[PDB]
Assembly symmetry: D2
Homo-oligomer: 458 residues x 4
């Protein structure tokens, strides 16, 4: 495992504390053995998500201080519009308060747009993999969310350069079975979050866009971690070996018609989202009409002016290769520490998290008894580290192909010594993994259990 030094220094700190073993046992019981219900005061190192927990720079805080809070015509709305033209060559923007607000703006408009002339009678969305909120919006609008990630993403320990790729054969098969008139949109998720923050190749993005364009299908780029995808392209595609990150990004977005973005990831923000449209002015107008009642007026979209200002600066800082190299290298360091100790992970590591394969880490625990959650609760009790489950506990009442515990790493927040604490904590549980029991419900809500369900050890 190789430690990479920070291309920055610390300007402001925030205290953290390790609760005592008895505090965490009380806290985990009070939360019903669901870390989602733990207060942050009971957590030492928080690896629940990489969303909205990033450390901003002094230039970002400076930009917030001079932010224009105007309800209409904010100086920062035009700066953001100019930034999206520079980065993506897209001509229209609609800010949103975060990524699922951006999805709420655009997806219903795409369905309405497709439903013209009696099309989309059995409408579907096709992605390499829909994120949970993305699939929820697909399903809320009466559509089905189809995921066709490459089969290589389900072979955890088998290296592949592009585990986020579309399965091109499945894409064509789905276009032939459902019909282009039923495909509301293709959603390219970069990186593919649910497959392990795994990158999609430039040539895979290109072939998907070519296929969609010959069938007249609209392509939306889910762009939460697009800078981490661009870095992987430059690292692993020889055609982009000497390209800048911004040149990679500029090429990526030739292969979509629009983007939905959670700026709470790669743009290094604590809040914020964006809709950007390449040139379809009609879809832009319809999305603006939905933005008004759902998010806010069209030049702030549910965001304070200061946060649009922070987004403009963070959009730049997130494309800096020296930072991406350290950021992604830190994820790779925690992953190497675990692999060296025989802990199975999604290999290679993705851009934002280490996905520990708990299906083989605790085989004695069946899927319905939530093996990855049992490992997560044990990691929390032993260490105060909070991780998130991506398996059977997520999206149930059901069986899952993968059972990952996601160690999600906020950007510029934790040091490699924090990584060592995380790795050593999981390594010290190797003898307890065999004797580990499963989990059964105490209270189960009808929907969205993983967020607010209560469990108990069997």
């Amino acid at each position: 495992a190789k430690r990479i030094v920070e291309p920055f220094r610390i300007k402001m700190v925030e205290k953290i504390r390790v609760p005592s073993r008895e505090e965490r046992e009380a806290a985990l019981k009070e939360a019903g053995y669901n870390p989602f219900l733990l207060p942050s005061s009971a957590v030492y190192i928080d690896l629940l998500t990489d969303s909205g927990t990033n450390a901003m720079s002094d230039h970002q805080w400076a930009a917030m201080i001079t932010g224009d809070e105007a309800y209409a015509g904010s100086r920062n709305y035009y700066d953001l519009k100019d930034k999206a033209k520079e980065l993506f060559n897209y001509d229209y923007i609609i800010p949103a308060h975060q990524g699922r607000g951006a999805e709420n703006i655009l997806f219903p408009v795409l369905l309405k747009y497709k439903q013209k002339e009696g099309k989309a009678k059995n409408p579907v969305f096709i992605s390499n993999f829909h994120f949970d909120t993305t699939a929820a919006h697909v399903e809320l609008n009466g559509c089905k969310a189809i995921n066709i990630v490459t089969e290589k993403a389900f072979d955890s320990e088998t290296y592949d350069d592009w585990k986020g790729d579309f399965d091109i054969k499945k894409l064509k098969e789905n276009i032939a079975q459902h019909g282009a008139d039923n495909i509301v949109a293709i959603v390219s998720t970069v990186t593919c979050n649910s497959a392990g923050g795994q990158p999609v190749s430039m040539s895979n993005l290109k072939e998907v866009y070519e296929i969609a364009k010959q069938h007249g299908i609209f392509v939306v780029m889910d762009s939460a971690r697009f800078c981490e995808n661009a870095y992987f392209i430059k690292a692993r595609d020889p055609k982009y070996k000497n390209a800048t990150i911004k040149e990679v990004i500029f090429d990526m977005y030739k292969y979509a018609d629009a983007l939905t973005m959670s700026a709470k990831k790669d743009p290094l923000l604590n809040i914020g989202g964006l809709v950007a449209i390449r040139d379809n002015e009609e879809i832009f107008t319809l999305a603006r009409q939905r933005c008004v009642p759902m998010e806010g007026f069209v030049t702030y979209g549910g965001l304070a002016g200061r946060d649009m200002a922070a987004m403009v600066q963070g959009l730049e800082e997130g494309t800096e290769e020296e930072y991406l190299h350290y950021r992604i290298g830190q994820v790779k360091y925690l992953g190497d520490r675990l692999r060296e100790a025989g802990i199975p992970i999604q290999y290679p590591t993705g851009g934002h998290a280490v996905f520990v394969d708990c299906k083989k880490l605790v085989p004695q625990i069946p899927g319905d008894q939530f093996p990855a959650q049992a490992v997560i609760n044990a990691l929390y009790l032993e260490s105060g580290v909070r991780a998130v489950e991506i398996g059977s506990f997520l999206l149930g009442r059901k069986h899952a192909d993968m059972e990952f515990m996601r160690l999600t790493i906020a950007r510029r927040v934790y040091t490699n010594d924090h990584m060592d604490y995380i790795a050593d904590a999981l390594i010290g549980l190797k003898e307890k993994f065999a004797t580990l029991k499963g989990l059964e419900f105490e209270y189960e809500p009808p929907v969205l259990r993983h967020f607010t369900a209560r469990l108990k050890p069997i």
Copy 2:
């Protein structure tokens, strides 16, 4: 006209400038004679809205700096939960990114909850006056938005203590006509924004709630300007003349089962919203299930942790009577300046804006030629001040006739001084003779729905 001194001093300033007469001309041209299309750089004093443009305190900024940005279980979420229990006596909260986000969380849930056993086949919402986004969400969910403000709200120059009240007779008539089983909810809007920021009396709130409870109707308090409403109750209701503002708030929320709040108003924030539920845990769980896909996880609701921290502090600052006295007194000062010069306004002034009655101000322009908008564009070109609402332009088409056609001079909180107010009043007064020669306005580009935002007009 009496100037009230600030119960604070300035700690941070923000530059503004008057663009030249030439620049203002060119600017309004490129904006198609629509101020909603103007960039902020073309505006001197911005009276478009009082939403999200407020000046925060140093204590609010300090709260943001130590805000907990955690995805789940943020320290500031629990503080906000305690604060809502303190102010409203409500046991459950769901943060939202702003007011219409709160409405998107709660209104679909109330509809689905009302339809649980097969009733509410013709669902409606009843309010003293649904705000634009509020009425939009009820209609996007298939219901009708029924507005029943008191008739006194329609006699502008004639003083009344409570021009935001419900018409209780119309409330009972609509219950009988549609049936209680079709009334998804009653929405008590305080202050009543569309009536001129005019207050609702405590006894009006009390009677509406009791009528609703005997019929089993859920009551929601639209709370964007609840502190300004509480101030007016203390000022005009003898029962509360000697109560604190917090005691008036506490009593107000005995007459609702939940609230939706834009924290961008009376809590003195630039962003933020809130859903609070008194004790109905089933509705709380259903609203939480909708908050997840629409806004965010249930312990931040589409807000940065620092904005929840700012909301906990701002909810306290917004109830302080010394501040409310100055805030509402500054709006009254602007109104008294225009009223003493013979400019008709909604009298008495509300809590957050002066509503200039343009029907009597420019009678030679019909409603379909947008008279209030003509006054606004004339005001802008004269001074650089940007105002909003046209009644007609806002009402749109079905062009439905407008009961009123106000120009709204909306005042952000703790932002402008009374010398800024003198500039606004003197600019409008200086136009008195020009209102006669004032031209109507016609569309050059017209969008269908939501024309007030993006239509490119041109002078007739």
Copy 3:
């Protein structure tokens, strides 16, 4: 009285409260009837100084956030150097933590410089009027501080354009009587704080510098309020009627060899100072050597990097004419309110404060009983406003006589911070003082309960008679 609207809007507020009459009486008694001992918690509107209480802008705060805190070679030190070259055409800068630290850097160096050839045997400094700290550093270094402001400054109610002018006749007389070899430096104070914030004309600055240069005398511009002085020059000198503020400033500093500046005044800061030297590299080297043990390393001079960053932005904002017009107009507004009500003041009002002439205002209390302090205490008890005394209480006792020094003026200074209070705050101040018009006759004198030997106005405890 004409209210001038703010050329800005408010972005952040600080709560203030009026303490109850009971609290104000208790606090003043606890403070020994000396508002300088009051905590800020007992003050509503604080008019003690215009120093370091200013409201900064969002651009100033943004500049602080990205400030470079390096010990040596801070990015903001080089920006400050470029800014002083732009504003003043001065080639060398030494930051200081505030104005009196800038005086502590420069004044002892000038004395040692003048002593190089065995000169300055009876050294003196000559100013239109040394400020208190300026005079203290002169005297601490064994020199005498000579003030020669125009006689017009002492005619309180008689208007004049330039009540801060040097008396040119006295300048030549002092040069002849002391000799150019004994005059360590001429200090041009702009505006002239002690004369009431009154401006110095460009032609008066020019003639002083011309007289000094032929005699080989080094000229220091005391520049705490140079932007307010530049505004008055543009307002009242026809030659500069169409010049920009920066053009006026650029001309002003042709008539000095260096400057000492409190950035806590016109540059709109809460802390900060500056030494800038036109072109004498030798004096720059000596002042750097004194900066190191007194203030800090030469690229921060006792300032956090963020404060140098704020100073670069505030130097720019302080020169903007629309702000200066509002700022100086607010002072004139408070002055006209009092003047229209019969309250005697230093007329015309200066750049930063209104000086109420309590000699004319009150008669039943003599100078040795501190008349201006009795009004200040009355004003505080009535309103929670804290003002500062510029009279017999401040003047002090004569060590030769051991008794009260006779004071030419018994002023109460209503000192106005920049971009902090509105014209409604001014009305509150004026109405408070006007409402005491009948009570002034029955106001009692003040006597010491505790008197320290030196600098008594800061910590002496008084009691009513």
Copy 4:
């Protein structure tokens, strides 16, 4: 070498970059081969000082935002007064803009106080080791600055618990030789910065104060790094095994009559200083009278209100044992990395820096040719790391004074750099082991008369 994990996480970052080899050589030439004259833009990792470069907490920034900027009676002045009473049990405070301003306030006052009744005609100050500005203020006022640190400090590689102690024998000898009536004050520097940030033991502080009280000598604690000194006392003195840091601090300040503090060190600030006096109201009044013309009015002392507010918060954070353990552990980690690789350092590492013994590293350069400065200039050109010299360059009388030690100080700001930054520093210096024998001395081009190392320009001797 053991890495200690941060008891915090990062909230805000500041970019740094590595200037190219050509930029550095251009920069160092323009800087006259004195890194003090280098712009920060030419530095990668800045180890020039631990003074005022620290990273504050969100609680400190929040305190600044609500700071009271009043000229008289600021709310934060009374908080600072209460905090000094809580921490040190001292009744009087005068804020200062930084440490040497605190010295400029107090030292001349102490000389004047001592000169009453016509004594102190040959006035001196005695310290375990005066810091540079401290000795400058002693000498500017016409006194002599006598340093009497333990000889243990001069054996770099031999461990000792308390290499910052006073030599008690030399203390008694200097009192007898000069007379107690000529000792203006004894200055106890904690930690002893010039000895290598090495702690003074509690019993050494006690014995020094007891000797001084029996002779009527005033004692000032130079307190820039008093928390790091308290940590070492708790770590190495068995008597304080079960004591809190604040109990150790409270006990330390029983053994002084006043303190002068650079708040730019252990209180974790970017600016700020403090004078605190235990109970001598007369010296308090005289120091206030000097504070007014030198620093500012006595309730802000040359500080913005926001900086006093940050000081009140940082004074608390600087006492937290979990932070001190990490902070001093990071210094020890850099030291152990260099010591494991054969680099001679002052052992054990002190609180705030690693002191590389260059008299052993580069023997072919004599002291008067500044051997530690030659290692520093070579370190910068190689890596962009800026260090500072503590030897002959820092040190009739104009002839080059002999230096007991020739140190390169790798000074570590608080909560700014990670242990991966420390690895970069260590590998960079380790990587110069074969170039050390080839290094050349340095000669003056411009020499100031006082505190020459700050602004002097040098040239290689080659």
